[PDB]
Amino acid sequence: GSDREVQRILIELLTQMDGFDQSTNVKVIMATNRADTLDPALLRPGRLDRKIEFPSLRDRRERRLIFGTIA
Amino acid sequence: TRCKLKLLRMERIKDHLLLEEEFVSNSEILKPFEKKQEEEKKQLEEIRGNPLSIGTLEEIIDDDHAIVTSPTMPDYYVSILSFVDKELLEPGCSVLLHHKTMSIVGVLQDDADPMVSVMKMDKSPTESYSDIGGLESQIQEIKESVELPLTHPELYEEMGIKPPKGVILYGAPGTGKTLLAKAVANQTSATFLRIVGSELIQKYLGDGPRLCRQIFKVAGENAPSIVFIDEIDAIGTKRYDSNSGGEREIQRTMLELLNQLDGFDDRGDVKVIMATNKIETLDPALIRPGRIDRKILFENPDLSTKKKILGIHTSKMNLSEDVNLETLVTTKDDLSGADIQAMCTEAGLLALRERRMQVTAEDFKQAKERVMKNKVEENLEGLYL
Amino acid sequence: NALVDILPPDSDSSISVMGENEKPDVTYADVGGLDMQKQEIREAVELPLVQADLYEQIGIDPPRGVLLYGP
Amino acid sequence: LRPGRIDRKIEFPPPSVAARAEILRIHSRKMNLTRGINLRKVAEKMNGCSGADVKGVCTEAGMYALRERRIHVTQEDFELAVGKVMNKNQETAI
Amino acid sequence: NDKVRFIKDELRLLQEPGSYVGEVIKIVSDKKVLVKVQPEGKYIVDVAKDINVKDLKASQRVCLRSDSYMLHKVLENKADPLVSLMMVEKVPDSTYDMVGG
Numbered sequence A: 001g002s003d004r005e006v007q008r009i010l011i012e013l014l015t016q017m018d019g020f021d022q023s024t025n026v027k028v029i030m031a032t033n034r035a036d037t038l039d040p041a042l043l044r045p046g047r048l049d050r051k052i053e054f055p056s057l058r059d060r061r062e063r064r065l066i067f068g069t070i071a
Numbered sequence B: 001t002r003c004k005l006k007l008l009r010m011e012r013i014k015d016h017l018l019l020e021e022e023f024v025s026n027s028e029i030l031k032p033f034e035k036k037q038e039e040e041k042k043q044l045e046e047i048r049g050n051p052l053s054i055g056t057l058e059e060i061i062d063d064d065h066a067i068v069t070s071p072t073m074p075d076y077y078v079s080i081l082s083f084v085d086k087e088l089l090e091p092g093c094s095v096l097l098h099h100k101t102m103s104i105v106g107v108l109q110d111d112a113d114p115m116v117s118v119m120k121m122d123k124s125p126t127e128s129y130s131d132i133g134g135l136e137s138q139i140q141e142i143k144e145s146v147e148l149p150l151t152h153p154e155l156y157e158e159m160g161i162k163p164p165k166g167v168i169l170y171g172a173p174g175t176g177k178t179l180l181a182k183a184v185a186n187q188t189s190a191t192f193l194r195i196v197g198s199e200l201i202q203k204y205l206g207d208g209p210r211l212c213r214q215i216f217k218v219a220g221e222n223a224p225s226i227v228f229i230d231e232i233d234a235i236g237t238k239r240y241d242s243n244s245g246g247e248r249e250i251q252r253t254m255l256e257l258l259n260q261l262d263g264f265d266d267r268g269d270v271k272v273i274m275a276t277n278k279i280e281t282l283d284p285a286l287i288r289p290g291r292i293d294r295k296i297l298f299e300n301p302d303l304s305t306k307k308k309i310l311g312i313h314t315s316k317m318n319l320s321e322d323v324n325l326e327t328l329v330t331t332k333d334d335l336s337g338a339d340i341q342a343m344c345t346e347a348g349l350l351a352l353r354e355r356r357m358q359v360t361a362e363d364f365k366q367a368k369e370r371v372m373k374n375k376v377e378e379n380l381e382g383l384y385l
Numbered sequence C: 001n002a003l004v005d006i007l008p009p010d011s012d013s014s015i016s017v018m019g020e021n022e023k024p025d026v027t028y029a030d031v032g033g034l035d036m037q038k039q040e041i042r043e044a045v046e047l048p049l050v051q052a053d054l055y056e057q058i059g060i061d062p063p064r065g066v067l068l069y070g071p
Numbered sequence D: 001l002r003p004g005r006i007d008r009k010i011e012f013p014p015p016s017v018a019a020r021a022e023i024l025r026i027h028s029r030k031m032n033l034t035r036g037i038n039l040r041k042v043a044e045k046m047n048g049c050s051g052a053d054v055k056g057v058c059t060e061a062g063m064y065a066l067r068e069r070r071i072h073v074t075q076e077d078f079e080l081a082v083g084k085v086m087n088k089n090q091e092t093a094i
Numbered sequence E: 001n002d003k004v005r006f007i008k009d010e011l012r013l014l015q016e017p018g019s020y021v022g023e024v025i026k027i028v029s030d031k032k033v034l035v036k037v038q039p040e041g042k043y044i045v046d047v048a049k050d051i052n053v054k055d056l057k058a059s060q061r062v063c064l065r066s067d068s069y070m071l072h073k074v075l076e077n078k079a080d081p082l083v084s085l086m087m088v089e090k091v092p093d094s095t096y097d098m099v100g101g
């Protein structure tokens, strides 16, 4: 039962994501720290479009910048 | 023509007359239908009314009572009333319930499933025996096991010997393991269930045996039946890695197939055809002679046999008079019958790119050369000599 | 279950617009580096609201939904 | 791959310098231009390897149009775009 | 006059027996239809005498009047499964001119 109830929530989100078009509204902005488990039905075009990257690697310049503000 | 219409004309107005006589003189007599008949149909309908709630008979108690489960949650200790066969109600069956006070008023339900339709082929292949060019000897080991005991069950019963059960069609690729299955499935006109061996690996755990128990149950119900298992090699060799039960899972499913094939059940008439290309991989318990009786084997068509194969594919085709069939056979030296079919299909395609109906001699020579390069020799018998 | 009248569109919302005073205290100043990311998301979320016209004129499709992955 | 199993095998090479120009134009028809831009010279300069990449030069040019609040996709925007797209592709692909 | 005859008699129409929405699973030749109200189970129930069972066919969303759940009318909208899988994948239409290259 648990799964069959999540499928409904996930269908609705996809349906109304295309309805959002031609409004002043900017679509849902959402975060996940996992990328392998995502449903690729969200990342098709016309729904979620832009993918932001956040690196783990820090070069020497970008590291000093973070130390600067906390300190 | 004359006599078939003439006898039908007499039978179909004599049928008319007898049905009128039975209808008039069973309505004026109240002991047969008449008075009971016009009140039971109207009452039965009216009393229970609607909605009729479908449920599932969870189990039946021998005393004309049952425990049925509504999808709406409440269970009920019901009674089993008028107009139901009480032997037909068994666990799993779907029943129609009288909504005012829950009693089984009957089952009217076919209960057609996509589980029976997926196994079933509505086959009408244009192939009949003698679309197999030569290899005539092999055809007449397969027909003696599968087809013949349906035509003449007299011979095996006179002799006193139990019919042979099961076959395995194995050999080199391209010798028509699938093409023979199609010839023998067309003639018998028995229920032909088809199931490819790859399907028996699926992702969930323990589903393999549930799927394997289901196939043979449809077949035993539909006797006489054939169950063709195409490339049962596939489960041993491959490792799709979708099934997270790993290799342990594949072994437990295999053991289920072994029990359904003979085991304890004592099933009805079920012949089995098992096609494979590599009999080595197959578990030795499956091949064991007792579940299968005859192991047919094929080999690569000969130079005399390849003339027969070519004659079948070149007959349908339109040709010019410039073609010479004999120069296309000799160049290839030991090439299967699958390649001969592609060589004809490739030539007709070159002529259709040039857009002329005739397939001339040049379209054949360009096609034959291209097909020898696509192949890949055989470094098994190259090792040898 | 007759439909005897209507309610407002803003009402009967389980989760309502925060910001009255629950709006968090962090700002672009406390944030440090990740200058590439700041620019992307400002272009993804902020510029469409203030100026819808720019995107239509130039003839680019506006970035709609935004996704954030990272470790 | 056995004979008679399929019937046709299509191969797609990575686009040549000639092909890139055509493909870059189909994506440019959707958005503004400016007189005098040679869509051919930007395809050559872009080494590239995909038509996916090529489409990203157009979208990235539109990003450089927003920051300066241009009124038209100009010749400077493509030169900046080519770089951003090529540098991002080479850091992940090597 | 159409207005005022309607307003006064409207109060007696609004004490409705309600209605339900099912969907035609399959018919049978007793003039009865198997329809599923979605939260609950399925029901076999007959059509009103006036509409036919010929009108009804594969997966038409149907009206019901809650009392005996009598089928009343086919609804404008159909639900069909094969269109919905090609819609969620989302592939936009193309042409030979777009491919060129």
Ligand SMILES: Nc1ncnc2c1ncn2[C@@H]1O[C@H](COP(=O)(O)OP(=O)(O)OP(=O)(O)O)[C@@H](O)[C@H]1O
Pocket (backbone or CB within 6 Å): B131, B132, B133, B134, B135, B172, B173, B174, B175, B176, B177, B178, B179, B180, B277, B309, B312, B337, B338, B339, B341, D004
């Ligand atoms: N002995 C034969 N006589 C005539 N035609 C043949 C023969 N063998 C193969 N063919 C032609 O080749 C086609 C493909 O053959 P088929 O599918 O039976 O090969 P196969 O040996 O079963 O391959 P696999 O190893 O994949 O099972 C057939 O449809 C048929 O037209």
Ligand SMILES: Nc1ncnc2c1ncn2[C@@H]1O[C@H](COP(=O)(O)OP(=O)(O)OP(=O)(O)O)[C@@H](O)[C@H]1O
Pocket (backbone or CB within 6 Å): A033, A066, A069, C030, C031, C032, C033, C034, C071
């Ligand atoms: N660029 C930065 N400048 C200043 N502080 C930072 C920066 N990046 C991270 N931090 C500090 O690290 C903390 C952790 O950040 P945050 O909780 O937003 O990570 P997250 O990406 O949401 O992780 P999760 O995967 O748990 O959601 C912040 O609250 C902040 O104090």
Ligand SMILES: [Mg+2]
Pocket (backbone or CB within 6 Å): B177, B178
């Ligand atoms: Mg085969």
